Amino acid sequence: NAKRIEGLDSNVWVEFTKLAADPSVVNLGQGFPDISPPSYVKEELSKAAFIDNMNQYTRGFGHPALVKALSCLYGKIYQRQIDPNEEILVAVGAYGSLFNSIQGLVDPGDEVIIMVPFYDCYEPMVRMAGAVPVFIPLRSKPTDGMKWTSSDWTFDPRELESKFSSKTKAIILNTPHNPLGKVYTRQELQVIADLCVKHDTLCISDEVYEWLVYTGHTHVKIATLPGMWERTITIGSAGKTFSVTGWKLGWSIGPAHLIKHLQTVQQNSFYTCATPLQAALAEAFWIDIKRMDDPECYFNSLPKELEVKRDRMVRLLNSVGLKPIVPDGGYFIIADVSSLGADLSDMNSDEPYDYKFVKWMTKHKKLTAIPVSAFCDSKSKPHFEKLVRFCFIKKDSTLDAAEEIFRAWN
Amino acid sequence: NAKRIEGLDSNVWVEFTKLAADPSVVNLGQGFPDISPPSYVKEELSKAAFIDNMNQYTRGFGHPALVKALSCLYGKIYQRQIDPNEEILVAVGAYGSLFNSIQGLVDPGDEVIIMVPFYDCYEPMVRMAGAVPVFIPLRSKPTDGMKWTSSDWTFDPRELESKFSSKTKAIILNTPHNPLGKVYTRQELQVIADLCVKHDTLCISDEVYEWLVYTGHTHVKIATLPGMWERTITIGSAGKTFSVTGWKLGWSIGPAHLIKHLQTVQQNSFYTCATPLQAALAEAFWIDIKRMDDPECYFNSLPKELEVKRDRMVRLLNSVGLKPIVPDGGYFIIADVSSLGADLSDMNSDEPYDYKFVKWMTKHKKLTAIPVSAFCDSKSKPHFEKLVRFCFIKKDSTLDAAEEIFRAWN
Structure with a gap:
């Protein structure tokens, strides 16, 4: 392989796809709208x-x-x-x-x-x-x-x-x-x-x-x-x-x-x-x-429509003690997970906490998301590894399914 | 600009799309099917x-x-x-x-x-x-x-x-x-x-x-x-x-x-x-x-549509003393131009003979083509600059309009 590309071949992202492929999981992971385009x-x-x-x-x-x-x-x-x-x-x-x-x-x-x-x-x-x-x-x-x-x-x-x-x-x-x-x-x-x-x-x-x-x-x-x-x-x-x-x-x-x-x-x-x-x-x-x-203009009506769902996802997250960062923009919300039952001692890697945690949530609770550390250079990851990212550009029925899961969460 | 791009910004093909600017000329230049897709x-x-x-x-x-x-x-x-x-x-x-x-x-x-x-x-x-x-x-x-x-x-x-x-x-x-x-x-x-x-x-x-x-x-x-x-x-x-x-x-x-x-x-x-x-x-x-x-597979029906348009194009090119090279494949035909009236005095400038000729045939015959020298390294152009490329993945109307021009050539 040519020099300009040594060590740029990492795709931990295909793992996150694999995760999300079992169809009885709610995918709140990669940034994939499941609402209709206009x-x-x-x-x-x-x-x-x-x-x-x-x-x-x-x-x-x-x-x-x-x-x-x-x-x-x-x-x-x-x-x-x-x-x-x-x-x-x-x-x-x-x-x-x-x-x-x-x-x-x-x-x-x-x-x-x-x-x-x-x-x-x-x-x-x-x-x-x-x-x-x-x-x-x-x-x-x-x-x-x-x-x-x-x-x-x-x-x-x-x-x-x-x-x-x-x-x-x-x-x-x-x-x-x-x-x-x-x-x-x-x-x-x-x-x-x-x-x-x-x-x-x-x-x-x-x-x-x-x-x-x-x-x-x-x-x-x-x-x-x-x-x-x-x-x-x-x-x-x-x-x-x-x-x-x-x-x-x-x-x-x-x-x-x-x-x-x-x-x-x-x-x-x-x-x-x-x-x-x-x-x-x-x-x-x-x-x-x-x-x-x-407001019929897409530039206006979409953020209006997404704000409602932002606020719906805050609540859902709060309802199990995942501590959310209400976002000013875009259509991800990040949540601190550490005040949850840190429960991964028996999961055998030195990946960061959040990969392990997202893996666990996918196995046990049937929901996937993305670990924030995926977004971090290697020396910065420890400062961000209890943080996990969820996407909410989704139709109600999907936020429903996710609602199902958080109600039964404990 | 980054060093990686030093002097790779010439696009001589902007100037060609200038000649295709459209004073009722039949454009036989870029690879641009004007047949319909399947x-x-x-x-x-x-x-x-x-x-x-x-x-x-x-x-x-x-x-x-x-x-x-x-x-x-x-x-x-x-x-x-x-x-x-x-x-x-x-x-x-x-x-x-x-x-x-x-x-x-x-x-x-x-x-x-x-x-x-x-x-x-x-x-x-x-x-x-x-x-x-x-x-x-x-x-x-x-x-x-x-x-x-x-x-x-x-x-x-x-x-x-x-x-x-x-x-x-x-x-x-x-x-x-x-x-x-x-x-x-x-x-x-x-x-x-x-x-x-x-x-x-x-x-x-x-x-x-x-x-x-x-x-x-x-x-x-x-x-x-x-x-x-x-x-x-x-x-x-x-x-x-x-x-x-x-x-x-x-x-x-x-x-x-x-x-x-x-x-x-x-x-x-x-x-x-x-x-x-x-x-x-x-x-x-x-x-x-x-x-x-x-015979209905596009893979068979296309080459066969095209052979006919090619054979049509060799005749036309011969009709008027442009010595064509009949291609075994693809949808371009190259033609030797050296032996017409060769004769381009309007056009001082050593840039290359084929460019001058393509400009000429545009003005005086309203046909465009691509000078073959454009597909050469600098040390090769002299060996190829009497050669001109025409495209024939064209609907009948278009080749028709080509006949009227060769027919009127002399």
């Missing part, structure tokens, strides 16, 4: 399949109707003009966008800063570019008194500064955050921008859950803050916008001198994406761009 | 769109249904039990497959051997891995007196032997060839396997047009030669197989100890491909696999 997104894929041109090659850098749509959607949010051809790249999900950003932008020997826990791909992407990932963790403050929230987690600004050196090329920021659920604040994003103009670094901002933010909270885009347009790549995703995780299209959006470089990676790796998916996506974005100010 | 290919994409699970994540290394069908199709072809999880990988086109093969198997400083002219991603794809492309030209033999054909082009076994040394990691082989239309012979494939076996190197085998061989030739797969299974990766296309160019789905077939590395690249780049394209393709495949021996 009918019109299904309809449009159908319409596009019957148009010959749609089934043939389309534009390397994104289907013109799709990037036309994106440029006008994000035009409004940025309070800007965004240039469909020089400032957008469409790629194989936000996953491929992150690959474009890092491969195009990051050199052997460079430092990239990653906030732990992270979408787990940040780590092996940076090591593959031959760069050094530099970790700094989120760390919790005292509560309000009532509940534990996403907002109770923060980073220490002075610790952050201490991470930047002349070797820092970039920082990767995920907000709304997976797994925490954290929606970053204008104050938190201002400290990060300060440093990556102070130091002349870039900032890769992964904002695929921009539309999922719940009440009390607002998505702010660091790329909109003074001095950051020049130096930010902000990445979005079809799968999370439109509950269509199987479409696998996403976008990078930033300045031409950076998008250039993403562009060359795409051109030399897979070249173009699928045409019917982009065609149909662009119709769906149109159906929703035009009603942004109504 | 009706059931389209049908299954729609059916899929309406199933909710068909719009959510699937197995990262290929939709299970889909790798099942590949394994059953290719096992019929390889004469062997092919394991659908460990010997296949589904990627974003053949284009993504080659990228997987290279990134995961080639190191900086390895040498990779390439036959010119070559599908044009090979040089950059290998150059991006920091390897050194080593080139060897295809050369003409005396014709049988009667016709020029793709099999009048071959390689020199001793010249090939001398491009191998201990830095050679691999040779890239493309058959049927784009743009020659050559179907490599058993005897030619034999000389390659000898050198791969003696030098312990890999062969990456690009066989997307593998079903498009015409009367008097067979596709044989180098992977099936004694000793080549363990050293070969062989790549196919949804685009080329079902005329669905915008679906961008391809696959690598090969031994576990090679696929696991491609899997690794896949997993740290794009992760999974699209569920609905792949659900439908699977069903497209099953449909044609159950009628392999029948």
Whole structure:
């Protein structure tokens, strides 16, 4: 195997699939919506399949109707003009966008800063570019008194500064955050921008859950803050916008001198994406761009629908003493499990507590989730190994089944 | 920009899509079927769109249904039990497959051997891995007196032997060839396997047009030669197989100890491909696999539709003194132009004769084609720049409109 990929072949994720495969288990694990996508997104894929041109090659850098749509959607949010051809790249999900950003932008020997826990791909992407990932963790403050929230987690600004050196090329920021659920604040994003103009670094901002933010909270885009347009790549995703995780299209959006470089990676790796998916996506974005100010718009109605279920899953968790972190955004909730009956002494590994615990819960209670340590670099895992992540983008009947289980839990 | 991408940002094919800009010209340039796809290919994409699970994540290394069908199709072809999880990988086109093969198997400083002219991603794809492309030209033999054909082009076994040394990691082989239309012979494939076996190197085998061989030739797969299974990766296309160019789905077939590395690249780049394209393709495949021996199987009915369009195209090319090379396979035809009015004074600039001629034929005849020099290394163009490539997977209307132009040529 080539050197750029030694030791990046870990897939503990296929184990979590194996887990979840017995069909008498309720899978609250990987981020797999089992609600219906909005009918019109299904309809449009159908319409596009019957148009010959749609089934043939389309534009390397994104289907013109799709990037036309994106440029006008994000035009409004940025309070800007965004240039469909020089400032957008469409790629194989936000996953491929992150690959474009890092491969195009990051050199052997460079430092990239990653906030732990992270979408787990940040780590092996940076090591593959031959760069050094530099970790700094989120760390919790005292509560309000009532509940534990996403907002109770923060980073220490002075610790952050201490991470930047002349070797820092970039920082990767995920907000709304997976797994925490954290929606970053204008104050938190201002400290990060300060440093990556102070130091002349870039900032890769992964904002695929921009539309999922719940009440009390607002998505702010660091790329909109003074001095950051020049130096930010902000990445979005079809799968999370439109509950269509199987479409696998996403976008990078930033300045031409950076998008250039993403562009060359795409051109030399897979070249173009699928045409019917982009065609149909662009119709769906149109159906929703035009009603942004109504609640019938998917950007509004989905978080409204998911908030109810967030609060339903908090309660369920609380009802067995799994101590939940009510999330500000996204559609995972994390729960401390340690005040549960630590019960795994006879399970023979030095994996982390949470893998062992999730294994046990899957065996005995018939529910699966994901251990937070999966989202941690190896030196950080002990600080996070009693934490476990559940996904709630699910239909009622699934939250029902899970309700069944927690009632009978003791 | 990252060093890995230095000067791989030229896309001369943006300028060609400029000439295809459409002052009533018949565009005979890019590989862009304008026939319809098979009706059931389209049908299954729609059916899929309406199933909710068909719009959510699937197995990262290929939709299970889909790798099942590949394994059953290719096992019929390889004469062997092919394991659908460990010997296949589904990627974003053949284009993504080659990228997987290279990134995961080639190191900086390895040498990779390439036959010119070559599908044009090979040089950059290998150059991006920091390897050194080593080139060897295809050369003409005396014709049988009667016709020029793709099999009048071959390689020199001793010249090939001398491009191998201990830095050679691999040779890239493309058959049927784009743009020659050559179907490599058993005897030619034999000389390659000898050198791969003696030098312990890999062969990456690009066989997307593998079903498009015409009367008097067979596709044989180098992977099936004694000793080549363990050293070969062989790549196919949804685009080329079902005329669905915008679906961008391809696959690598090969031994576990090679696929696991491609899997690794896949997993740290794009992760999974699209569920609905792949659900439908699977069903497209099953449909044609159950009628392999029948004239209605798309695998038989396509080559046969196409032979006729080819023979039509050779006449037209002759009608007007463009000396065509009749291809044994694929859906491109190359034509020698040297002997017309040759005569391009408007067009100062040593860039290459074929580019100037394609520009000319666009302006004055409203026909576009692709200059063959575009599939060469720089040191090879002079040996190929009187050659021009035309595409014929075209509906009757389109070839019709071509007749009217050759008919009016003089």
